[PDB]
Design a protein around this ligand. Structure first.
Ligand SMILES: *[C@@H]1O[C@H](CO)[C@@H](O[C@@H]2O[C@H](CO)[C@@H](O[C@@H]3O[C@H](CO[C@H]4O[C@H](CO[C@H]5O[C@H](CO)[C@@H](O)[C@H](O)[C@@H]5O)[C@@H](O)[C@H](O)[C@@H]4O)[C@@H](O)[C@H](O)[C@@H]3O)[C@H](O)[C@H]2NC(C)=O)[C@H](O)[C@H]1NC(C)=O
Ligand SMILES: *[C@@H]1O[C@H](CO)[C@@H](O)[C@H](O)[C@H]1NC(C)=O
Lengths: 77, 146, 49, 49
């Protein structure tokens, strides 16, 4: 129902399937003792007390969905 | 803390489907209320001294939903949740043209396969248009600020 | 939104409930610490799978 | 990172997949990650190279 800025030509650049450099893992897990990746309570706050809570939570030491953005081909400049 | 409203074209004719434990086609395929929070339904009518709101063409709704899989033998219904829309709405258009309209779409194997099929019917307008409002209230989502 | 580019680690969370799409970040609240506080809430029409 | 979201998944005509029918959500970082643009709107392709 609103506006949209159209900039440039519809001549798309070549796109490749070259995941050989991509697939190399990193051992980067999480910690619950250091409290990595926990949503703050959405309707109440507390002080110096222990609180049971029910929410949308991850697991611990998860593998994850590790990706990284790969730059394109550039011969010189 | 916060308030939520929805409004829709609800004539008085199916007002008997207002109950909390209702399992009618409007309850089964269109919407189900919030069982953990208070709610209210108000069915109002267009006043004569009010032109601020328009009148649509006809009341239209759905009364069936079925996920037939690619095996053409296994069929599974859907359960609508509170303030939620099923994937039934993702394929049915914004209105239903007449009674018994069949809306179908191909399904990928990862989501089940086959053809999702749904059936829609209709109720015509009365002398004056009636609107349905549903209010739900919540205490523990944000600051008490309204 | 606007955000300051930094060198310190940051976190983001995304979820969907009946009151909409919920985006959580620590930049707006805790730069040097970290917590998923609600910095955005889309009043979405549907639940995304 | 950028995120595209929908409850609809379909395959393309060539055999590839990734088609998302109806309205679709897109979150995009812009300006070397300074802008947080997002829309749940209709996306369209074109048949160029
Ligand atoms: C946040 O919450 C935490 C835990 O819930 C709090 O930590 C405890 O807080 C309570 C409340 O103040 C402390 O209880 C206090 O105990 C005092 C005991 O006095 C005697 O001991 C003193 C030395 O203390 C050490 O030795 C005793 C006995 O071995 C141990 O129990 C202690 O833990 C210490 O190791 C002496 O100096 C004194 O002369 C006495 O002989 C008592 O006097 C107080 O009235 C109170 O009841 C408790 O000790 C804390 N535990 C800790 C620090 O491990 C924390 O304070 C909260 N923070 C807030 C509220 O800001
Ligand atoms: C974000 O950037 C704009 C333009 O650079 C600036 O005017 C605005 O104040 C910034 N946001 C905040 C919260 O300061």
């Amino acid at each position: 129902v609103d506006v949209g800025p159209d900039s440039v030509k519809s001549a798309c650049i070549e796109v490749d399937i070259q995941q050989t450099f991509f697939d190399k893992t990193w051992p980067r897990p999480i910690d619950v003792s250091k409290a990595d990746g926990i949503i703050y309570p959405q309707g109440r706050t507390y002080s110096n007390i222990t609180i049971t809570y029910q929410g949308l939570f991850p697991y611990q030491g998860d593998h994850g969905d590790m990706y990284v953005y790969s730059a394109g081909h550039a011969t010189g400049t | 803390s916060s308030l939520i409203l929805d409004y829709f074209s609800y004539p008085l004719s199916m007002k008997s489907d207002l109950s909390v434990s209702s399992a009618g086609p409007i309850s089964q395929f269109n919407y189900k209320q919030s069982f953990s929070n208070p709610t209210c339904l108000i069915l109002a009518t267009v006043p004569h001294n009010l032109t601020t709101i328009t009148k649509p063409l006809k009341y239209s709704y759905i009364n069936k939903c079925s996920r037939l899989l690619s095996d053409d033998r296994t069929e599974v219904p859907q359960l609508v949740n509170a303030n939620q829309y099923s994937p039934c709405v993702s394929i049915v258009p914004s209105t239903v043209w007449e009674d018994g309209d069949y809306y179908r779409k191909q399904l990928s194997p990862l989501e089940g396969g086959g053809w999702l099929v749904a059936s829609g019917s209709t109720v015509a307008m009365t002398e004056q248009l009636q609107m349905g409002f549903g209010i739900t209230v919540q205490y523990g989502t944000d600051t008490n600020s309204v | 939104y606007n955000i300051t580019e930094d060198e310190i680690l940051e976190w983001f969370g995304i979820t969907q409930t009946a009151q909409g799409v919920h985006l959580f970040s620590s930049r707006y609240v805790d730069l040097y610490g970290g917590n998923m506080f609600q910095f955005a809430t889309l009043p979405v029409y549907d639940t995304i799978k | 990172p950028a995120f595209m979201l929908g409850s609809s998944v379909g395959n393309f005509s060539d055999g590839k997949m990734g088609r998302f029918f109806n309205h679709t959500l897109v979150l995009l970082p812009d300006g070397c990650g300074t802008l947080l643009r997002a829309f749940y709107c209709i996306l369209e392709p074109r048949s160029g190279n």
